[PDB]
Amino acid sequence: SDSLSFSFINFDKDERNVIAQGDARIVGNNILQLTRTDSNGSPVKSTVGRILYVAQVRLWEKSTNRVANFQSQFSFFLESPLSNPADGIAFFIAPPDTAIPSGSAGGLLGLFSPKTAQNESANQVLAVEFDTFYAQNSNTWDPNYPHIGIDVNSIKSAKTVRWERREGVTLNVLVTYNPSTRTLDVVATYPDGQRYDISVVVDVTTVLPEWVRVGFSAASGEQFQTHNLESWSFTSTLLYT
Amino acid sequence: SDSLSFSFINFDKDERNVIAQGDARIVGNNILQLTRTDSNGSPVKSTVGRILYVAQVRLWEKSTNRVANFQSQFSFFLESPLSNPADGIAFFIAPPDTAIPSGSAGGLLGLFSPKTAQNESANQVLAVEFDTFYAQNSNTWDPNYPHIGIDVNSIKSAKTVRWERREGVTLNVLVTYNPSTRTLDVVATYPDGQRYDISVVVDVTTVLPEWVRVGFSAASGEQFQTHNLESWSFTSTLLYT
Ligand SMILES: CO[C@H]1O[C@H](CO)[C@@H](O)[C@H](O[C@H]2O[C@H](CO)[C@@H](O)[C@H](O)[C@@H]2O)[C@@H]1O
Ligand SMILES: CO[C@H]1O[C@H](CO)[C@@H](O)[C@H](O[C@H]2O[C@H](CO)[C@@H](O)[C@H](O)[C@@H]2O)[C@@H]1O
Ligand SMILES: *[C@@H]1O[C@H](CO)[C@@H](O)[C@H](O)[C@H]1NC(C)=O
Ligand SMILES: *[C@@H]1O[C@H](CO)[C@@H](O)[C@H](O)[C@H]1NC(C)=O
Ligand SMILES: [Ca+2]
Ligand SMILES: [Ca+2]
Ligand SMILES: [Mn+2]
Ligand SMILES: [Mn+2]
Numbered sequence: 054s055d056s057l058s059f060s061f062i063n064f065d066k067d068e069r070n071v072i073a074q075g076d077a078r079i080v081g082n083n084i085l086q087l088t089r090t091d092s093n094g095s096p097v098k099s100t101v102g103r104i105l106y107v108a109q110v111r112l113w114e115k116s117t118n119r120v121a122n123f124q125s126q127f128s129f130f131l132e133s134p135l136s137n138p139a140d141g142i143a144f145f146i147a148p149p150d151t152a153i154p155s156g157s158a159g160g161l162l163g164l165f166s167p168k169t170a171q172n173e174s175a176n177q178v179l180a181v182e183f184d185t186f187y188a189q190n191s192n193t194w195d196p197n198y199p200h201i202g203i204d205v206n207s208i209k210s211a212k213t214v215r216w217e218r219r220e221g222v223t224l225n226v227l228v229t230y231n232p233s234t235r236t237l238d239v240v241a242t243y244p245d246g247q248r249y250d251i252s253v254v255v256d257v258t259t260v261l262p263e264w265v266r267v268g269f270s271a272a273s274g275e276q277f278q279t280h281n282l283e284s285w286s287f288t289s290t291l292l293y294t
Numbered sequence: 295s296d297s298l299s300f301s302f303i304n305f306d307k308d309e310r311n312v313i314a315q316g317d318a319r320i321v322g323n324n325i326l327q328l329t330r331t332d333s334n335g336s337p338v339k340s341t342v343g344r345i346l347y348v349a350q351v352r353l354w355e356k357s358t359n360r361v362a363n364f365q366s367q368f369s370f371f372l373e374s375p376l377s378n379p380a381d382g383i384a385f386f387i388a389p390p391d392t393a394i395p396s397g398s399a400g401g402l403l404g405l406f407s408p409k410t411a412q413n414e415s416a417n418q419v420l421a422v423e424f425d426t427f428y429a430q431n432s433n434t435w436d437p438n439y440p441h442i443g444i445d446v447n448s449i450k451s452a453k454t455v456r457w458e459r460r461e462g463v464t465l466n467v468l469v470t471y472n473p474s475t476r477t478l479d480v481v482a483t484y485p486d487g488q489r490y491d492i493s494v495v496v497d498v499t500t501v502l503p504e505w506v507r508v509g510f511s512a513a514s515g516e517q518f519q520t521h522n523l524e525s526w527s528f529t530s531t532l533l534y535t
């Protein structure tokens with residue numbers, strides 16, 4: 054598998070190529086609703102939902118010293134009646150058998166377990182998070198404001214940028230990885246043009262195994278909001294260093 | 295799933311995204327060998343092997359009047375000690391649960407059943423075949439020469455072009471479907487530039503279900519040859535009519 058690409062303009066309730074985990078489901082109006090809702094569509098507490106694309110990605114190959122580039126383009130929106138809505142949505146990459154960890158319904162975003170969430174040697178997760186909940190006596194690892202972060206085997210982001218959450222508004226995101234510069238970059242844009250950029254140097258060959266799956270995760274703990282993925286397109290190609 | 299693309303520059307023995315059927319196997323030299331060989335690598339009688347890509351393709355959608363384009367580019371070579379090597383290799387599209395039919399190890403190319411092989415209403419197969427065996431008292435449906443054919447729910451090709459088999463030589467093939475003209479085109483070239491073209495008008499929405507898998511099939515009956523797929527790339531995008 055030297056390359057893979059796919060796109061979802063919207064989401065099909067009869068989709069065949071998506072592994073859904075936890076509370077994730079595709080709605081009648083073709084939106085991927087990651088976190089659980091009640092029967093009126095209102096967000097609920099203590100929920101994780103994730104999706105992965107079914108086909109595995111060859112992220113790198115040691116025998117040929119190849120590493121893949123990738124791009125992930127997606128749009129999402131969040132809704133909540135709360136002044137401190139939680140917890141957030143993330144694009145992520147993990148081993149193919151990745152499953153929702155225990156204790157992840159909350160600030161761990163469905164991605165980490167409490168005992169190991171800040172121990173990089175215990176994890177294999179690369180993620181780009183949109184984090185709306187940052188209370189300093191609880192999400193102690195966060196900066197004290199809403200933020201976009203790049204997470205490298207830890208819920209404490211390697212780097213963040215201050216972000217503004219906008220109730221019901223769709224954010225457009227492009228995540229790219231350049232293996233020649235080992236740079237993971239993120240550009241997020243709201244409809245009025247407000248832009249957010251964050252990037253880190255990261256060697257994926259030390260973070261993740263050779264074969265991975267890619268997808269999204271979201272969670273709510275005591276505070277809550279819906280996490281709605283509208284669309285997603287992904288591409289990856291193995292390249293020589 | 296609104297688009298899918300993938301590429302195999304060669305074949306990984308540890309590939310994750312290929313469904314292998316029958317005798318198909320990936321060699322230590324990264325070649326997909328569709329038909330069975332003995333302990334010395336010599337081709338044998340009465341064998342079928344097929345592969346499908348794991349991710350399903352949405353080829354069309356009735357309720358929205360969408361139909362997908364597709365392109366499939368691939369290379370293969372055939373080897374045999376026989377004067378009448380058989381039976382051939384085909385790129386094919388079929389329902390996602392497609393399995394090797396009984397009686398298909400021979401001129402039916404792993405694609406059709408003997409009692410229904412020329413009854414279009416009984417089948418759901420679109421294929422581009424490279425057919426090396428054409429004995430008129432046996433493969434009665436074939437022209438009396440080696441040929442490339444487009445098969446629309448029948449082993450009797452809707453159209454063929456005369457072809458020359460070249461022992462051990464790689465043929466490079468591009469198959470494309472244009473939904474706006476309903477045209478399926480095939481262009482095949484040998485390394486010296488010798489070219490073969492064949493095309494048909496076919497409405498895939500009357501041939502195949504909305505979701506399909508794509509792949510290759512090969513078979514040998516009483517006469518035999520190896521069928522070696524070297525590389526394959528595919529793309530499909532679902533579009534409005
Ligand atoms: C009001 O909720 C805040 O205060 C509570 C009492 O101290 C905390 O338990 C609570 O933490 C949980 O919810 C948050 C927000 O969903 C989540 O990030 C965290 O991991 C816990 O699940 C929160 O700080
Ligand atoms: C010597 O093989 C030829 O003659 C036999 C007796 O007439 C046929 O049975 C035989 O047909 C089988 O093999 C061919 C070639 O592999 C295959 O195309 C066909 O479907 C049968 O399996 C062949 O004509
Ligand atoms: C971090 O994780 C490693 C690997 O699982 C473990 O051996 C180590 O004890 C952990 N360290 C801390 C400080 O928790
Ligand atoms: C062709 O197949 C159809 C559908 O399976 C069947 O009803 C019909 O009898 C067949 N026609 C033949 C064998 O001539
Ligand atoms: Ca947080
Ligand atoms: Ca034949
Ligand atoms: Mn954070
Ligand atoms: Mn034929």
Ligand code: NA
Nearest residue numbers: 054056057300
């Ligand atoms: Na692939």
Ligand code: NA
Nearest residue numbers: 090094095279
């Ligand atoms: Na909702």
Ligand code: NA
Nearest residue numbers: 107108348349
């Ligand atoms: Na798959």
Ligand code: NA
Nearest residue numbers: 151163164165
């Ligand atoms: Na995880």
Ligand code: NA
Nearest residue numbers: 372373374520
């Ligand atoms: Na051979």
Ligand code: NA
Nearest residue numbers: 433434435436
């Ligand atoms: Na006939």
